[PDB]
Coordinates of C-alpha atoms and ligand atoms in Angstrom, one line a residue:
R31 CA 107.6 106.0 110.6
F32 CA 105.0 107.8 108.4
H33 CA 102.4 110.6 109.1
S34 CA 99.1 109.2 110.4
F35 CA 96.4 111.2 108.5
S36 CA 92.7 111.3 109.5
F37 CA 90.6 110.0 106.6
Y38 CA 89.1 113.6 106.6
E39 CA 92.6 115.2 106.0
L40 CA 92.9 112.8 102.9
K41 CA 89.2 113.5 102.0
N42 CA 90.3 117.2 102.2
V43 CA 93.6 116.8 100.2
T44 CA 91.8 114.6 97.5
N45 CA 88.9 117.1 97.3
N46 CA 86.5 114.5 98.9
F47 CA 88.3 111.7 96.9
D48 CA 86.9 113.6 93.7
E49 CA 86.1 110.6 91.4
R50 CA 86.6 112.9 88.3
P51 CA 89.9 112.3 86.4
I52 CA 93.0 114.4 87.2
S53 CA 93.1 115.1 83.4
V54 CA 89.8 117.2 83.7
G55 CA 90.7 118.9 87.0
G56 CA 89.6 116.1 89.3
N57 CA 91.6 113.9 91.8
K58 CA 91.1 110.3 90.6
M59 CA 94.4 109.2 88.9
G60 CA 93.9 105.5 88.6
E61 CA 91.8 102.5 89.8
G62 CA 94.8 100.5 91.1
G63 CA 94.4 96.8 92.3
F64 CA 92.3 96.9 95.6
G65 CA 91.9 100.7 95.7
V66 CA 91.4 104.0 93.8
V67 CA 94.4 106.5 93.8
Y68 CA 93.7 110.2 94.1
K69 CA 95.9 113.2 93.4
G70 CA 96.1 115.4 96.5
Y71 CA 98.1 118.2 98.1
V72 CA 99.3 117.8 101.7
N73 CA 100.6 121.3 102.3
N74 CA 102.4 122.0 98.9
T75 CA 103.4 118.3 98.5
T76 CA 101.4 116.6 95.6
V77 CA 100.5 113.2 97.0
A78 CA 99.0 110.0 95.6
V79 CA 96.2 109.0 98.1
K80 CA 95.4 105.3 97.5
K81 CA 91.9 104.9 99.1
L82 CA 91.5 101.1 99.5
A83 CA 88.0 99.7 98.7
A84 CA 86.5 96.1 98.7
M85 CA 86.4 96.3 94.8
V86 CA 86.9 92.7 93.3
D87 CA 87.0 89.6 95.7
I88 CA 88.9 91.4 98.6
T89 CA 87.9 90.9 102.3
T90 CA 88.3 93.8 104.7
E91 CA 90.9 91.7 106.7
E92 CA 92.9 90.9 103.5
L93 CA 92.7 94.7 102.5
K94 CA 93.8 95.7 106.0
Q95 CA 96.7 93.1 105.8
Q96 CA 97.6 94.6 102.4
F97 CA 97.5 98.1 103.9
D98 CA 99.6 96.9 106.9
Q99 CA 101.9 95.1 104.4
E100 CA 102.2 98.2 102.1
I101 CA 103.1 100.3 105.3
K102 CA 105.3 97.4 106.7
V103 CA 107.2 97.1 103.3
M104 CA 107.3 100.9 102.7
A105 CA 108.8 101.3 106.3
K106 CA 111.6 98.8 105.5
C107 CA 111.9 99.8 101.8
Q108 CA 112.9 103.4 101.0
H109 CA 114.6 103.4 97.5
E110 CA 114.7 105.9 94.6
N111 CA 112.9 103.2 92.5
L112 CA 110.2 102.4 95.1
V113 CA 107.2 104.8 95.5
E114 CA 107.4 106.7 98.8
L115 CA 104.7 106.2 101.4
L116 CA 104.2 109.6 103.2
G117 CA 101.6 108.1 105.5
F118 CA 98.1 106.5 105.7
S119 CA 94.6 106.8 107.2
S120 CA 93.0 103.9 109.1
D121 CA 90.7 106.3 111.2
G122 CA 87.4 106.3 109.2
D123 CA 85.6 104.9 106.1
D124 CA 88.2 103.4 103.7
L125 CA 92.0 102.6 104.4
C126 CA 94.2 105.2 102.7
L127 CA 97.9 105.2 101.7
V128 CA 99.5 108.6 101.0
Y129 CA 102.5 108.5 98.7
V130 CA 104.9 111.1 97.1
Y131 CA 102.9 111.8 93.9
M132 CA 104.3 110.3 90.7
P133 CA 103.7 113.0 88.1
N134 CA 104.1 110.6 85.2
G135 CA 101.8 107.9 86.9
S136 CA 102.1 104.3 85.8
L137 CA 104.5 102.9 83.2
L138 CA 101.3 101.2 82.0
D139 CA 99.5 104.6 81.5
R140 CA 102.7 106.1 79.9
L141 CA 103.2 103.0 77.7
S142 CA 99.6 103.4 76.5
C143 CA 100.1 107.2 76.3
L144 CA 96.9 107.4 78.5
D145 CA 95.5 111.0 78.7
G146 CA 97.6 112.0 75.7
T147 CA 101.0 111.9 77.4
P148 CA 103.8 111.6 74.8
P149 CA 105.1 108.1 74.0
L150 CA 108.1 107.1 76.2
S151 CA 111.3 107.5 74.2
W152 CA 113.3 104.2 74.1
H153 CA 115.9 106.2 76.1
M154 CA 113.3 106.8 78.9
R155 CA 112.1 103.2 78.6
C156 CA 115.7 101.9 79.2
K157 CA 115.9 104.3 82.2
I158 CA 112.5 103.0 83.4
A159 CA 113.4 99.4 82.8
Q160 CA 116.8 100.0 84.7
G161 CA 115.0 102.0 87.5
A162 CA 112.2 99.4 87.8
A163 CA 114.9 96.6 87.9
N164 CA 116.8 98.7 90.5
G165 CA 113.5 99.0 92.5
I166 CA 112.9 95.2 92.2
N167 CA 116.6 94.5 93.0
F168 CA 116.2 96.7 96.2
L169 CA 113.0 94.8 97.1
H170 CA 114.8 91.5 96.5
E171 CA 118.0 92.7 98.3
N172 CA 115.6 93.4 101.2
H173 CA 114.0 89.9 100.8
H174 CA 110.6 91.3 99.6
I175 CA 108.9 89.5 96.7
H176 CA 106.7 92.2 95.1
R177 CA 104.3 89.5 93.6
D178 CA 102.6 92.1 91.3
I179 CA 105.5 93.6 89.3
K180 CA 103.5 95.1 86.4
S181 CA 103.6 98.4 84.4
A182 CA 100.6 99.6 86.4
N183 CA 102.7 99.2 89.6
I184 CA 105.9 100.8 88.1
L185 CA 105.1 104.5 88.6
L186 CA 107.1 107.3 87.0
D187 CA 108.3 110.4 88.9
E188 CA 108.9 113.9 87.3
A189 CA 112.1 112.4 85.7
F190 CA 110.4 109.1 84.5
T191 CA 112.3 107.4 87.3
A192 CA 110.6 104.0 87.6
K193 CA 109.0 103.7 91.1
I194 CA 107.8 100.2 92.0
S195 CA 104.5 100.7 93.8
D196 CA 101.8 98.5 95.5
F197 CA 103.6 96.3 98.1
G198 CA 100.2 95.2 99.6
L199 CA 100.8 91.7 98.2
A200 CA 104.6 92.0 98.9
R201 CA 106.1 89.0 100.8
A202 CA 109.2 88.6 103.1
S203 CA 111.8 85.8 102.5
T209 CA 110.5 78.4 98.1
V210 CA 107.2 78.9 99.9
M211 CA 103.7 78.2 98.4
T212 CA 100.4 80.1 99.0
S213 CA 96.8 79.1 98.8
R214 CA 95.9 82.8 98.1
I215 CA 97.4 83.0 94.6
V216 CA 97.7 86.8 93.9
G217 CA 99.3 89.0 91.2
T218 CA 98.2 90.0 87.7
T219 CA 97.7 86.9 85.5
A220 CA 99.3 88.5 82.4
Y221 CA 102.5 89.3 84.4
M222 CA 102.6 86.2 86.6
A223 CA 105.2 83.5 86.2
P224 CA 103.8 79.9 85.8
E225 CA 105.0 79.2 89.4
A226 CA 103.3 82.4 90.8
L227 CA 100.1 81.3 89.1
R228 CA 100.5 77.9 90.9
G229 CA 100.9 79.7 94.2
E230 CA 104.8 79.6 94.5
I231 CA 106.0 82.8 96.2
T232 CA 109.6 83.4 94.9
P233 CA 111.5 86.6 93.8
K234 CA 111.9 84.6 90.5
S235 CA 108.2 85.4 89.9
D236 CA 108.9 89.2 90.0
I237 CA 111.7 88.7 87.5
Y238 CA 109.2 86.9 85.2
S239 CA 106.6 89.7 85.8
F240 CA 109.4 92.2 85.2
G241 CA 110.1 90.4 81.9
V242 CA 106.4 91.0 80.9
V243 CA 107.1 94.7 81.9
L244 CA 110.2 94.7 79.7
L245 CA 108.0 93.3 76.9
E246 CA 105.4 96.1 77.7
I247 CA 108.3 98.7 77.6
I248 CA 109.7 97.3 74.3
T249 CA 106.2 96.8 72.7
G250 CA 104.1 99.6 74.3
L251 CA 101.6 96.7 74.5
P252 CA 99.9 96.0 77.8
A253 CA 100.6 92.5 79.2
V254 CA 97.0 91.6 78.5
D255 CA 94.6 93.1 75.8
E256 CA 91.4 91.0 75.4
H257 CA 90.9 92.8 72.0
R258 CA 94.4 91.8 70.8
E259 CA 96.0 88.5 69.4
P260 CA 97.9 87.4 71.3
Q261 CA 95.9 88.7 74.3
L262 CA 98.9 88.0 76.5
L263 CA 102.0 90.0 75.7
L264 CA 104.3 87.2 77.0
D265 CA 102.9 85.0 74.1
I266 CA 104.8 87.4 71.7
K267 CA 108.0 86.0 73.4
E268 CA 106.9 82.5 72.1
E269 CA 106.0 84.0 68.7
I270 CA 109.5 85.7 68.6
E271 CA 111.3 82.5 69.8
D272 CA 109.4 80.4 67.2
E273 CA 110.6 83.1 64.6
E274 CA 106.9 83.6 63.6
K275 CA 107.4 87.3 64.5
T276 CA 110.6 89.3 65.2
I277 CA 111.0 91.7 68.3
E278 CA 111.0 94.6 65.7
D279 CA 107.4 93.5 64.7
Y280 CA 106.3 94.0 68.3
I281 CA 108.7 96.9 69.1
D282 CA 106.6 100.0 70.1
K283 CA 106.2 102.1 66.9
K284 CA 105.5 105.1 69.2
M285 CA 109.4 105.5 69.6
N286 CA 111.9 107.0 67.1
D287 CA 115.0 106.4 69.3
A288 CA 114.7 102.6 69.7
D289 CA 118.0 101.1 68.4
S290 CA 117.7 97.3 67.5
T291 CA 120.8 96.5 69.7
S292 CA 119.4 97.8 73.1
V293 CA 115.8 96.7 72.2
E294 CA 117.2 93.2 71.4
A295 CA 119.4 93.7 74.6
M296 CA 116.2 94.5 76.6
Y297 CA 114.2 91.8 74.8
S298 CA 117.1 89.4 75.7
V299 CA 116.6 90.5 79.4
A300 CA 112.7 90.2 78.9
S301 CA 113.2 86.7 77.3
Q302 CA 115.6 85.6 80.2
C303 CA 113.2 87.0 82.8
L304 CA 110.3 85.2 81.0
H305 CA 112.1 81.7 81.2
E306 CA 109.1 79.5 82.2
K307 CA 111.6 77.7 84.4
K308 CA 111.9 80.0 87.5
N309 CA 115.6 78.8 88.3
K310 CA 116.8 79.5 84.7
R311 CA 115.7 83.2 85.0
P312 CA 118.2 85.8 85.9
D313 CA 118.0 87.0 89.5
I314 CA 117.1 90.8 89.6
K315 CA 120.9 91.5 90.1
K316 CA 121.6 89.9 86.7
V317 CA 118.5 91.7 85.2
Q318 CA 120.0 95.0 86.6
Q319 CA 123.5 94.2 85.2
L320 CA 121.9 93.2 81.8
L321 CA 119.8 96.4 81.7
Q322 CA 122.9 98.5 82.8
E323 CA 125.0 96.7 80.1
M324 CA 122.1 97.4 77.6
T325 CA 122.7 101.2 77.9
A326 CA 126.5 100.9 77.1
Ligands
YK0_1 C1 99.6 104.8 89.7 C2 98.4 105.8 89.5 C3 97.5 105.9 90.7 O1 97.7 105.1 88.5 C4 98.9 107.2 89.1 C5 98.4 107.6 87.9 C6 98.8 108.9 87.4 N1 98.5 109.5 86.3 N2 99.2 110.7 86.3 C7 99.2 111.6 85.3 C8 98.6 111.2 84.1 C9 98.6 112.1 83.0 C10 99.2 113.3 83.1 C11 99.2 114.3 82.0 O2 100.6 114.5 81.7 C12 99.7 113.7 84.3 C13 99.7 112.9 85.4 C14 99.9 110.8 87.5 C15 99.7 109.7 88.2 C16 100.2 109.2 89.4 C17 99.7 107.9 89.9 N3 100.2 107.4 91.1 C18 100.9 108.0 92.0 O3 101.2 109.2 92.1 C19 101.3 107.1 93.1 C20 102.5 107.2 93.8 C21 102.8 106.3 94.8 C22 102.0 105.2 95.0 C23 100.8 105.2 94.3 C24 99.8 104.0 94.4 F1 98.6 104.5 95.0 F2 99.6 103.5 93.2 F3 100.3 103.1 95.3 N4 100.5 106.0 93.4

């Protein structure tokens, strides 16, 4: 069970969902999929308040289902590598999800050094990869398919502990769906065709591992290749090496563990869902990767 907040409480803790960035004293931290996330203090606990809004091609019912799912998942799924729902507001205006704040925000934001945060060390990236995989493993152990494993949804605590976030699109447990959801640039071919399988999360995690290795977002429209997972094809076709795409904003990246992680990334990014490692193998390979 979580604390049921009034929308006003969350309005109050988020300084009336202050749209100004946290970086300039405001409360807006990120415009996540299907909602804006606001820094807040409930008592002395820094919280992430995800205010859910219609945004892009979301119905109220689907948004409420994703809220209900987030809470449903977050109820079942407490793990050091899953974000922690403290509670929610359904009372007024927008639906709100209150989480234990993640001081280091998204892996995406940290990989991009958004707001001038220092580049993640390879060491921290390995921990993040490991943690994220431990998060995904826990979700899969608990027969939850995240269905939107992406750097944006891997949040980073005070310790850069990977916290898998956003279980709105999470699914219990292969089955198919008419409502194909997830982030294109992270989605397995089968996820993009509406297959719902944990194997898709592995693929999406593979893209994350490429993001971690490369510091490149899964998609950059102003980049060639636009899709990071293409660099896997460029590396497999020996057009490029992993060291060509390896994030230059690291000094502590050793070829062995980066190749080890790329090897996990590659295996995760097997276009054949069944030839991908299950998250347990991904875990083992990411543990093996740090000696
Ligand atoms: C992910 C998000 C919203 O983009 C986010 C961005 C952040 N940026 N910074 C930040 C950036 C730069 C500096 C300068 O060093 C300091 C802090 C902290 C952040 C924290 C965030 N999320 C959470 O705290 C959080 C926790 C659980 C569930 C959720 C969710 F709503 F996503 F489900 N969010």
